[PDB]
Amino acid sequence: PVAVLKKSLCMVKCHWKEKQDYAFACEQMKSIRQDLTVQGIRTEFTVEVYETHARIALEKGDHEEFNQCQTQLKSLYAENLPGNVGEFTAYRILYYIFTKNSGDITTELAYLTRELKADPCVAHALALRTAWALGNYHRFFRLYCHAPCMSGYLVDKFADRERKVALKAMIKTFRPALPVSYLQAELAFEGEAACRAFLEPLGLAYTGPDNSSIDCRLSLAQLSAF
Amino acid sequence: LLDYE
Amino acid sequence: DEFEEFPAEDWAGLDEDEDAHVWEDNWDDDNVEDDFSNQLRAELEKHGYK
Amino acid sequence: ITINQYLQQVYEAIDSRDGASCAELVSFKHPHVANPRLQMASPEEKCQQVLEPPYDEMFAAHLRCTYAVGNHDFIEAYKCQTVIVQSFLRAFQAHKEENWALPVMYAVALDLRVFANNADQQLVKKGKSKVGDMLEKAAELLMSCFRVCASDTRAGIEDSKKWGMLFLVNQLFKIYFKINKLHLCKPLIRAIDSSNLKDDYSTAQRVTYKYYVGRKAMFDSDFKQAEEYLSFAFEHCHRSSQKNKRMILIYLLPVKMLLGHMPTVELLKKYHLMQFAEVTRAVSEGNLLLLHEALAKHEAFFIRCGIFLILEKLKIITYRNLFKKVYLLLKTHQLSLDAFLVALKFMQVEDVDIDEVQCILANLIYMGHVKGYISHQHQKLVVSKQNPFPPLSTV
C-alpha cells in the first residue's frame, strides 16, 4: 500500500487541518512512517510525509518529535530529493539556536549554497542567528515578529529566555527607571497584560504604585533570581 | 544628570 | 588538511622559531587623528556635534 | 632482501627487547615496504615457524598489508592493520612492568589512522559508504590502546606505559577533529590532567595536545584558556614544520583579537595568512563596513577554516571601538544616542533606528565593555568620569 498511502496522508492532513487533534494525527503519521521504513521507500514521497509530520509537530510544540523528524529529513535531503530544502534548512538552524548547539551551526552554515541563502526562510533564520549571537535583542525580536512559514514556532521556544536576557541587559543599563511600555515595545509583546504577566514573577521593584516603570536600581539584586 | 557610579 | 606530524619528537628550544612582539595592544588608545577617524568626524560634524 | 632475513631481524629485535628496530621493521616509513621481495600474499607459514605468537600473526598481517598497499587495496590494508593492532595490543598487555615495545605502538597506531583515511576515501570513491565509517573503528582501537597505556599504574614511572598516553590521545583528537565530534575529547582532556606526567611528555606530543585543546576551548567560548593553550602551542612549535605553525595561527588569531591583541602585518605576511589582514584593520579601527567587506570577500577561507562564526564575534569589538571613537571625538561624558545613530548609519548598516543603538549600547554595558547607563527619557548615554571604556583584557 504505497500509492494509496498518499491519499491516506491527504486524509490525515485534512484531519489535522480541521479537527486539530494532535493525538490521532501523530499516531497515524507515526504508523505511516514505520510502514514506509519497513518497505524501504526513500523517494520524494518519504520527504513529503516527513515534512508533513515535522510541520504538524511544530504546531503542538513537541520539539523532540520535530527534532527526530528534521534529523531524518537531513539524511533524506542528502540524496538530492526534491522538496522544501530551504524551509527545513532554516528549522535546523533555529533548533540549533534553541539548544545552543554552537558547534552544529558552523557545520550547517558551511554546507549552505547560494540557492539556499536566497530562500526567504533560510535568510530569516540566518539573520535571527546573527542577532542572537551578537545579543541584538531589538533586531532579534523585530525578526521574531514577522516570521515566515512555521519559523516562528521554533523561536517561540527560546523567546522567553532571550526576553529574560534582554531584560537583564536593560535593567543593568536603563537608569533610574525603565518604562514598561518601552519594555513591551522592544521585547515584541502583544498587549500590556502579556508584558505585565511576564515581568511580575521576577519580583522587580517598580516606581510608584501605578507601576508606570520598573526601578532598575532596586531590582539589580533580583537579577540573579531569574 | 547624575553620573554613573 | 590536518595537523602534521613533527619530524623530531623532541627539539628543546633551538628549533622553536621565536616571533617577537607579533601582537600589539597599543592600538587601543586616544589616537583619533588617523584617516578613518577624520572621516567619521566629518560625517558627525555634518549633523552637528562639534 | 629475502623474507628469511627479514623474519630473522624481526625475531632478533623482539628477543632483544629493542623497541626502535621492531618499530622500524613494522612501520611504513621504513624502505622495506618498497622492497618487492618483502611484499607477499600468504607468508603466514614463515611467521608461524619463525616468530612465537602473537608476533607471528602481527607480522604476517603486516606482510600481507604491505602487499595490499603495493596493490593499493586500502580496505584490505586497513583490515590487516586492524589485525596488527589487535595482536600487538595483546602482546603489549602481555608485557609486565616493561615498556620496551612502546615505540612499536606509536608507529603501528599512526599507520592505522592513515590507512583508515584512505579506506574511507576509497569508500567515498566506490560510493558504498559515507565519510567517517572506518574512522570511528580506528578511534575505538586507539581508545583501547589508550586504556592499556593508562592502566599501567603499579609499574614504576621509569618503565610505565603511561609514557605512551599523550601520543594516543593526540591521535584520537585527530579523528575526533575530522569527523566533527568534539565532545568525545572531554574524557581524554581530564585524563591527561589527572596524570602527574602532564608536563613530562615529549615536546611534539605536548604541543599537539595543547593545540587541539586550545582549538576545543576556542570552539567552546573559553578564550582565556584557549589563548593560554594556543600561545604555548604556537610558541613551542617546530621551526621546520611551518604548516603546523600556520594552522595554529589560524585558530590563535581570532582568540587574540577577541581578547584585545591585534596581530601585526609582519606576522600575517610571514605565515601567508593575509586573509585576516583587512579584518584586523577593521577591528582596531572600528570600521564596520570594512569588517563586513573583508568577512564577505574571504568568506570561503574562513568557512573552510571553521572560524567564521568566531570571527563574526569581532563585531562587538568593532562596536566598542566605533563608540570609543565617537566618545573621543565628542569629548563629552553625556553623549546623545543620535551621535551613535549617525555613526552607525555612516557604516551603511541596514535600517538602523535609535532603538537598535540603545540595544547595542545596552549589550555593551551588560558585557562590561562600557561603564555607563542610558537615560531613556533624555535619550543620553551617561558614561563614567573615570574608566569609561575599560581595556579588553580586563573584560
Side-chain angles (χ1 to χ4, degrees):
Chain A
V2 183
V4 183
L5 197 149
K6 168 174 190 76
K7 199 70 64 180
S8 78
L9 180 69
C10 290
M11 183 269 303
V12 63
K13 275 175 70 76
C14 288
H15 197 117
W16 176 246
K17 277 297 181 181
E18 271 95 10
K19 297 289 305 179
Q20 265 274 357
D21 191 5
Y22 180 61
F24 165 76
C26 193
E27 290 152 336
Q28 174 66 264
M29 212 156 296
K30 285 296 278 196
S31 304
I32 287 171
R33 293 167 67 257
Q34 90 191 5
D35 291 353
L36 259 71
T37 55
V38 162
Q39 272 157 345
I41 313 159
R42 296 274 303 225
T43 60
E44 192 267 343
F45 179 74
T46 311
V47 164
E48 162 146 12
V49 70
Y50 271 102
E51 279 196 350
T52 307
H53 192 85
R55 282 204 216 96
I56 285 186
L58 280 184
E59 198 173 340
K60 196 58 177 66
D62 206 314
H63 56 82
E64 288 297 328
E65 205 83 36
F66 157 80
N67 177 34
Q68 304 154 35
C69 288
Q70 59 90 26
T71 309
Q72 200 270 353
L73 199 57
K74 176 192 312 180
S75 69
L76 274 186
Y77 284 157
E79 55 190 8
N80 54 89
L81 272 192
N84 318 286
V85 53
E87 155 166 355
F88 275 89
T89 315
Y91 302 164
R92 276 188 260 166
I93 312 184
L94 293 194
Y95 194 77
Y96 291 162
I97 294 162
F98 165 55
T99 64
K100 290 186 171 186
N101 212 337
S102 76
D104 279 337
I105 301 184
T106 70
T107 74
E108 186 54 79
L109 262 64
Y111 314 135
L112 280 192
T113 70
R114 295 286 94 79
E115 291 87 7
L116 285 179
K117 287 166 175 276
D119 189 59
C121 308
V122 178
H124 168 270
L126 286 177
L128 191 74
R129 191 271 307 162
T130 299
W132 166 81
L134 305 169
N136 195 334
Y137 57 79
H138 170 257
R139 198 169 284 258
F140 177 94
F141 290 121
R142 212 170 67 191
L143 293 161
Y144 162 60
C145 287
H146 318 317
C149 65
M150 298 280 174
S151 170
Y153 288 171
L154 276 301
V155 188
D156 268 331
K157 279 152 177 48
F158 53 97
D160 214 12
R161 171 185 89 207
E162 196 77 9
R163 273 170 194 162
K164 284 186 192 301
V165 162
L167 189 140
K168 279 198 202 106
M170 281 168 141
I171 285 189
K172 183 140 189 200
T173 77
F174 287 96
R175 302 219 164 98
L178 174 53
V180 62
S181 74
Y182 178 82
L183 202 153
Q184 71 182 358
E186 204 80 2
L187 293 202
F189 272 134
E190 56 94 20
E192 190 262 334
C195 174
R196 192 56 54 117
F198 159 72
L199 53 86
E200 170 51 52
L202 314 183
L204 310 173
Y206 309 143
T207 310
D210 47 10
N211 313 325
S212 304
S213 308
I214 67 170
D215 192 296
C216 56
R217 204 174 47 115
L218 273 80
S219 302
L220 290 171
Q222 274 68 27
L223 258 58
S224 63
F226 62 93
Chain B
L1 309 176
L2 74 162
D3 201 288
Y4 159 70
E5 310 169 303
Chain C
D1 46 355
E2 198 64 37
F3 208 67
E4 266 191 354
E5 316 271 337
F6 297 86
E9 195 77 359
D10 203 348
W11 51 73
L14 195 48
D15 301 11
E16 296 177 342
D17 199 1
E18 186 193 4
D19 283 341
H21 321 317
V22 288
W23 311 103
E24 282 169 352
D25 215 340
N26 57 74
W27 56 270
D28 192 12
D29 60 349
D30 307 339
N31 192 4
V32 76
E33 65 259 17
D34 60 355
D35 173 43
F36 168 77
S37 67
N38 276 136
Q39 208 174 9
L40 173 61
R41 170 189 280 148
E43 174 79 6
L44 272 171
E45 183 75 34
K46 278 187 180 65
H47 309 161
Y49 315 115
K50 60 100 179 177
Chain D
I1 298 103
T2 69
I3 69 164
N4 309 128
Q5 301 178 2
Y6 172 79
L7 265 294
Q8 287 307 311
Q9 288 155 0
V10 165
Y11 161 70
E12 289 152 34
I14 287 290
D15 201 283
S16 168
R17 278 186 296 278
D18 181 26
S21 309
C22 179
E24 286 311 313
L25 295 196
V26 74
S27 77
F28 278 73
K29 258 68 173 200
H30 204 67
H32 91 289
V33 161
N35 220 13
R37 268 75 41 82
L38 269 301
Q39 326 177 2
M40 289 187 115
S42 282
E44 289 99 13
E45 51 270 20
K46 299 289 185 181
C47 290
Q48 170 83 47
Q49 68 187 296
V50 165
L51 315 166
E52 295 184 356
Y55 301 122
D56 57 354
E57 174 187 350
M58 186 210 316
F59 278 93
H62 178 265
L63 278 192
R64 60 192 194 222
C65 172
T66 189
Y67 165 81
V69 73
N71 285 129
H72 306 265
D73 197 335
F74 278 144
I75 302 105
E76 188 72 23
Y78 179 79
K79 186 176 289 294
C80 296
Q81 199 69 24
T82 285
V83 167
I84 290 155
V85 171
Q86 268 161 8
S87 44
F88 164 76
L89 263 292
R90 283 208 315 279
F92 190 57
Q93 198 177 3
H95 300 125
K96 299 285 98 176
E97 286 199 354
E98 289 162 4
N99 51 5
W100 70 268
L102 201 57
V104 182
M105 183 191 76
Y106 296 151
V108 184
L110 192 138
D111 266 333
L112 180 145
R113 192 190 55 79
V114 166
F115 284 155
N117 275 345
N118 289 7
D120 272 348
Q121 288 172 15
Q122 209 70 37
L123 296 202
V124 169
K125 186 261 289 180
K126 206 182 190 73
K128 256 194 184 173
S129 89
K130 56 174 277 290
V131 192
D133 197 358
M134 303 277 103
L135 280 187
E136 55 188 4
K137 193 87 168 179
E140 285 175 346
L141 284 173
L142 298 180
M143 187 60 97
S144 61
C145 306
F146 174 54
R147 298 265 181 72
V148 176
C149 282
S151 80
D152 221 335
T153 65
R154 187 55 59 86
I157 58 167
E158 161 68 26
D159 302 332
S160 280
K161 274 173 219 186
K162 294 186 180 178
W163 301 112
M165 270 177 61
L166 193 53
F167 165 87
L168 290 168
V169 162
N170 290 341
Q171 294 303 312
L172 286 168
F173 282 172
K174 303 199 166 127
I175 310 180
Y176 293 166
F177 272 67
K178 192 165 181 65
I179 59 191
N180 281 130
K181 302 185 184 177
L182 264 290
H183 55 281
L184 292 156
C185 307
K186 189 53 201 298
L188 313 175
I189 284 177
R190 72 172 66 92
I192 300 306
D193 293 345
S194 64
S195 309
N196 47 4
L197 323 175
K198 192 191 51 173
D199 52 0
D200 287 323
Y201 292 122
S202 193
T203 318
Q205 298 306 326
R206 193 171 66 243
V207 161
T208 304
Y209 171 76
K210 292 287 185 148
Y211 150 78
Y212 274 125
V213 173
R215 255 191 79 171
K216 180 173 160 289
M218 174 207 71
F219 279 138
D220 290 4
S221 308
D222 198 355
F223 305 125
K224 298 299 287 291
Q225 210 172 12
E227 184 195 7
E228 183 204 18
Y229 283 142
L230 284 161
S231 300
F232 178 85
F234 167 75
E235 267 193 29
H236 286 37
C237 203
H238 205 243
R239 180 195 65 244
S240 162
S241 160
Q242 285 283 339
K243 162 166 172 171
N244 288 308
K245 202 171 263 271
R246 178 175 186 284
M247 283 204 52
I248 294 157
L249 272 175
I250 283 181
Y251 300 88
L252 172 66
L253 292 173
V255 173
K256 293 293 214 160
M257 284 151 90
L258 285 167
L259 296 194
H261 305 284
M262 293 294 140
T264 41
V265 179
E266 288 85 3
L267 170 84
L268 297 167
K269 175 59 165 60
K270 163 167 179 180
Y271 296 92
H272 308 125
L273 286 173
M274 282 314 278
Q275 279 102 37
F276 287 81
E278 270 186 28
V279 178
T280 284
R281 187 151 76 78
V283 181
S284 57
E285 262 188 4
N287 196 340
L288 280 154
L289 191 55
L290 185 49
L291 174 62
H292 293 137
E293 291 156 354
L295 282 184
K297 159 182 186 180
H298 293 305
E299 177 82 43
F301 172 71
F302 299 139
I303 280 299
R304 181 172 74 236
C305 294
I307 62 175
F308 178 68
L309 299 189
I310 291 94
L311 264 192
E312 91 168 0
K313 274 199 289 215
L314 290 176
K315 214 198 272 194
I316 293 92
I317 320 290
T318 318
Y319 284 138
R320 175 215 167 266
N321 294 296
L322 181 63
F323 295 163
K324 178 163 194 172
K325 287 212 167 196
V326 173
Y327 160 62
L328 289 155
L329 293 159
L330 297 202
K331 284 164 211 165
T332 310
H333 293 306
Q334 300 154 30
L335 302 163
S336 46
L337 310 161
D338 187 46
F340 305 101
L341 171 60
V342 165
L344 264 190
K345 268 176 198 181
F346 178 47
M347 294 289 105
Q348 282 154 55
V349 186
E350 297 274 12
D351 52 46
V352 192
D353 40 355
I354 206 76
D355 301 325
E356 194 168 5
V357 169
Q358 271 173 343
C359 173
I360 292 156
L361 287 170
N363 173 41
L364 282 190
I365 298 171
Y366 180 55
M367 269 189 173
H369 290 281
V370 191
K371 290 300 174 191
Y373 76 93
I374 43 178
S375 183
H376 168 63
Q377 197 195 348
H378 303 294
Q379 299 261 310
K380 311 265 273 186
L381 178 138
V382 179
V383 73
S384 74
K385 295 285 186 187
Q386 71 262 11
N387 200 34
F389 291 84
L392 290 162
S393 312
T394 69
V395 173

